[PDB]
């Protein structure tokens, strides 16, 4: 759903901030 | 069905795990949708499944606070399903844990809280529990009000509140900063193959009640001390649940006769009440030495003790002893026959790699500034094991602390969390604390894979294709050489000039195979001959078999030749005691272990023919000096790192240096490099690196091989036609 | 077991070690096992405290005592036979014994059958593959061989399915096959334990894969078959059969294949000592280890035991100059001194192979030793045909490859550079086939190439050399 899709967004710029 | 394996997660973040798209379609769920799981004790966990190429398809990977949250260890299994009517929440309350807030105050929630959820969208449960880390501190939180239940996304634009004495731990969880399986950084394949042999005999019990199995039931480790020989045992039994017992040698033998013996004894009759258990023994050698060794009554007595306790596993239920030994021979041979210690794991020294990730581990709390640069330390960090990379980020975080905090707090036992968390550590305080540091492992072999590629070789074009053949083919094609009967060789000798690049061919193959590069020196073969000590060559070869897939790189192999006189010597053959041991150790291994060996020498004339028959270093490549066309790709290769200004003509120095090798290339790109730099960081008290640089560095740069050494080496090249 | 009588106090030892023949007694007919006898009744040089040397005298008045101890026998078992105190095998006490060893490729997947016999394969399983992969193994690591490879299919299947209670379905487990991948990955995890042990078995060198050669064939045949296929017209005649045979000439003419096939045929046990070892006990003064080879001979018999680089002590002397004395040693010595005591009825034939014979103690030929000696030449035109064509027995061949023009050509090589040349075509198709896909045969480009990378190994100078030492023996 689009607050799921608001939620993977967040945890994705999250890790690739952290990781890369 | 919908049931997914528990393991470990790539991604630290504590709302992320990561599915194989095959069970993502079956699931019926995309990328970044928010799913519920189902562990032990009706306990949940709500999170948003990711995808990668990593995870297979029967398992789930998640991170130790999703496991913690759920009641459930590595190897179990949980439901999974899909929830898409997941919602924002309105008001959450949340309250740190009391055992991670020791002397610490403040306004935790700015510090803390308000970063981790502020635009975060992580979905939470009442009752989870997850990790903030920062301000050198890492301190857990738990959700304990919510408007919306049982679980919603945490939006910001929610009211999030703090207010209550910290919470005490309940009994049903664990501390999120207990030693697990994330605080390893090198040797993770390693970590691996104990996992194998370890989680399921403890995990999953019945299954080898019921199976036809044997579980192991002893794993020796060994390598230098402080590379996490006594972390790794004690992290599996963290992870598995096992109740971890200690042993160390000395503590036993410090006691008197019949102590020693009821006091080993002892903690395995405990182990077995405690069961499932870990026995770890520390400085094996030391508690049970080679018989052959000693001299006492206690000495032969207390290593009868043990070679009965562990024959006693038998009848005692799901115990595993591991015991830690710096030399896999220090140790008396019956420990190591069937059952007993029958596996053993080479955990050695971190490689550059492996540094990097234990200085990224041990600085997960710090706070650390836009100049500091981790990999240059694990680069300049070499002979350093994992006790010296935590000592040096621990000194950096205590020099950051003295030179800010120190002129803002009290000499008393609490802080603000905000002054903490405002302190940032510095490169220059990694750079001291590297002065103070000195490796404690630094003339040990240390095993690594290399990070050497092709595109860092000038010319030897039809060499690094024919290393391409001999190492890669036989396995990437094996139906061909069965077709034609066809015995893949063992392994190449190079000879010629040095300073050519035999280094960087055997690393470059064993980079683009992935596998483990394992540099042997003329020195190692010299001492073994001298020393009487040709045991050593199986421990050579061994370590090449357990580091498989691996390259075994032995270099001036003519050592042992000139050792017999190279050049006059008496009136015999290059046979000996140390070559018989290598010729013998390479005929009894097979090529479907996936282990290659590449010889060196720059003396071929003297080498033992017998070396190069069949199964052994049969192939023969010449590496001569670089010619025009190569010379100049040396150049340009080593000046890929830094950019060469227009008036820099360097096909013009190559046609110059006609005697140079690739080594010496190298200094004189490296010395115009260091010149370049000089005149940048001047200039401030330069974009590029300059003509002016070069024909500067030309006036300390030479060749390293002489005229006549040249022509002996083309002459041998010439006489094998 | 020795480490359980060990361990105890001075007292409790020889009290425990006597209570287990009481309690044998007691319950005759009744065996007693002793594991790792080495460790309670270690060679008496090795030991030389009180304590170990009672529990000693208390093992041996134990099995004196078993002329009284009705029915009751001592079974023992240690690493090495010659690790333990000599009075053991005094008439009776441990007098007799059998040499267990270590399993052939026949033993082995009779192994790896018995225990699967629980286990389910599938289809794609081959237990001779294993069986003939496994060298070096025992049966401990076969066993744990099928553990392995029983953990990683159960890993696979039973955690998948998400089996997790006390019991197994019965279903499930029928349907848990292993599968050649699993045993094959498990190969690749398991190391052996006897991998550097000394190997004894019949050969798998048959006639066919050696080229040319006809009459030493015919007379390996004569000095190994017939003083037992015929020995009622050896005394009829006379006939003091052969002990042994010295091959000579140049290297890389079939010299080991000659001594296998000889072997294999008769379905004799091969023992195959090398320069290293010759080498190990002249560098070490370890000669004590040549009597134990030919005691191993003796117990494999029926046996061919091959000495190959008999100039590799020779060498190591110095060779041609060396210092001032001869060309006795300390191994040659107790090699002429076993082969000597060597009983001509015991079925042990003993071959020697050497590139040097003119720097060995002539002593070796004398009658009764190594009295028979052949020559191996460079094969000669047909022989390098039938080399050829035993090389490539094993490969698809195009029918463009003139096998007898190549051998013409290669009159100057040996059977070890025909084998080269071969390997290289072989080699050749290999990279050819694989850059097709990105080549069903061995063309004869193949081999034109390859014969312009082979060279002759053995030199003109080196052939005049061992022609008159030939011609010297007549
Ligand atoms: N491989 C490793 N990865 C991460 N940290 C390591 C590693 N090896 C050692 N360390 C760290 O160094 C220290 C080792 O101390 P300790 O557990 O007493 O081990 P040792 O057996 O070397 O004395 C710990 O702080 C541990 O976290
Ligand atoms: N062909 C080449 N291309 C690029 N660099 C080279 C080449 N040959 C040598 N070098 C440089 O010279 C250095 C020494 O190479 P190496 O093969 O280790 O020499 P050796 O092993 O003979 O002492 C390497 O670090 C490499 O940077
Ligand atoms: N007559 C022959 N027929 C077939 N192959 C041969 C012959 N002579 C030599 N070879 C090849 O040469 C190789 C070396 O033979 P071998 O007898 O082991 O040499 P050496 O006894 O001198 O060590 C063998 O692997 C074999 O393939």
Request: aromatic share 6%; charged share 30%.
């Amino acid at each position: 759903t689009n607050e799921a899709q608001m939620a993977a967004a967040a945890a994705l710029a999250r890790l690739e901030q952290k990781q890369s | 069905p919908n049931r997914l394996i528990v393991d470990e997660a790539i991604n630290e973040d504590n709302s992320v795990v990561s599915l194989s798209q095959p069970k993502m379609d079956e699931l019926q769920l995309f990328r970044g949708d928010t799913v519920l799981l189902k562990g032990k004790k009706r306990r949940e966990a709500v999170c948003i499944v990711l995808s990668d190429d990593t995870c297979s398809d029967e398992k789930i990977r998640m991170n130790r606070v999703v496991r913690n949250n759920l009641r459930v260890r590595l190897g179990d299994v949980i439901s999974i399903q899909p929830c898409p009517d997941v919602k924002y929440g309105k008001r959450i309350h949340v309250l740190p844990i009391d055992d991670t807030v020791e002397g610490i105050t403040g306004n935790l929630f700015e510090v803390y809280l308000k970063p981790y959820f502020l635009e975060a969208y992580r979905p939470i449960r009442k009752g989870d529990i997850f990790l903030v880390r920062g301000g050198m501190r890492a301190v857990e939180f738990k959700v304990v009000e919510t408007d919306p239940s049982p679980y919603c996304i945490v939006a910001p634009d929610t009211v999030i509140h703090c207010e209550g004495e910290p919470i005490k731990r309940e009994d049903e969880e664990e501390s999120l900063n207990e030693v697990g399986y994330d605080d390893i950084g090198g040797c993770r394949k390693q970590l691996a193959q104990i996992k194998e042999m370890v989680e399921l005999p403890l995990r999953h019990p019945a299954l080898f009640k019921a199976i036809g199995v044997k579980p192991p039931r002893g794993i020796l480790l060994y390598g230098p001390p402080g590379t996490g020989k006594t972390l790794i045992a004690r992290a599996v039994a963290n992870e598995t649940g096992a109740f971890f017992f200690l042993i160390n040698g000395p503590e036993i033998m410090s006691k008197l006769a019949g102590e020693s013996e009821s006091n080993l004894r002892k903690a395995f009759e405990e182990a077995e009440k405690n069961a499932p258990a870990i026995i770890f023994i520390d400085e094996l050698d030391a508690i049970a030495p080679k018989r052959e060794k000693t001299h006492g009554e206690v000495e032969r007595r207390i290593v009868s003790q043990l070679l009965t306790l562990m024959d006693g596993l038998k009848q005692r239920a799901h115990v595993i002893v591991m015991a830690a030994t710096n030399r896999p021979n220090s140790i008396d041979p019956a420990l190591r026959r069937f059952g007993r210690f029958d596996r053993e794991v080479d955990i050695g020294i971190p490689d550059a790699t492996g540094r990097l990730e234990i200085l990224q581990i041990h600085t997960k709390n710090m706070k650390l500034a836009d100049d500091v640069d981790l990999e240059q330390v694990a680069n300049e960090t070499h002979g350093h094991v994992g006790a010296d990379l935590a000592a040096l980020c621990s000194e950096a975080a205590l020099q950051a602390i003295r030179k800010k905090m120190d002129l803002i707090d009290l000499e008393d036992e609490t802080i603000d969390a905000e002054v903490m968390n405002s302190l940032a550590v510095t490169m220059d305080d990694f750079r001291w604390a590297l002065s103070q540091s000195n490796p404690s492992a630094l003339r040990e072999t240390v095993v690594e894979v290399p990070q050497v590629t092709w595109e860092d070789i000038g010319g030897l074009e039809d060499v690094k294709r024919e290393l391409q053949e001999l190492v890669q083919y036989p396995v990437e094609h094996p139906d061909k050489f069965l077709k034609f009967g066809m015995t893949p060789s063992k392994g190449v000798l190079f000879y010629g000039p040095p300073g050519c690049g035999k280094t960087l061919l055997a690393k470059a193959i064993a980079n683009e195979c992935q596998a483990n590069f394992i540099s042997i020196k003329g020195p190692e073969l010299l001492t073994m001959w001298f020393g009487e000590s040709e045991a050593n060559v199986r421990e050579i070869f061994d370590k090449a078999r357990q580091a498989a897939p691996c390259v075994l790189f032995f270099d001036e192999l003519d050592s042992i030749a000139k050792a017999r006189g190279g050049n006059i010597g008496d009136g015999g053959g290059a046979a000996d005691r140390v070559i018989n041991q290598i010729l013998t150790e390479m005929d009894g291994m097979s090529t479907k272990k996936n282990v290659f060996i590449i010889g060196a020498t720059n003396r071929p004339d003297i080498i033992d023919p017998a070396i190069l028959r069949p199964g052994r270093l049969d192939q023969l490549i010449y590496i001569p000096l670089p010619d025009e066309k190569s010379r100049v790709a040396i150049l340009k290769a080593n000046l890929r790192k830094s950019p060469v200004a227009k008036d820099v003509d360097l096909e013009f120095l190559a046609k110059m240096t006609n005697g140079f090798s690739g080594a010496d290339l190298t200094e004189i790109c490296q010395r115009a490099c260091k010149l370049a730099i000089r005149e940048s960081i001047e200039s401030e008290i330069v974009p590029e690196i300059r003509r002016d640089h070069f024909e500067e560095a030309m006036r300390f740069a030479r060749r390293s091989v002489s005229d006549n050494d040249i022509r002996k080496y083309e002459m041998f090249a010439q006489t094998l036609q």
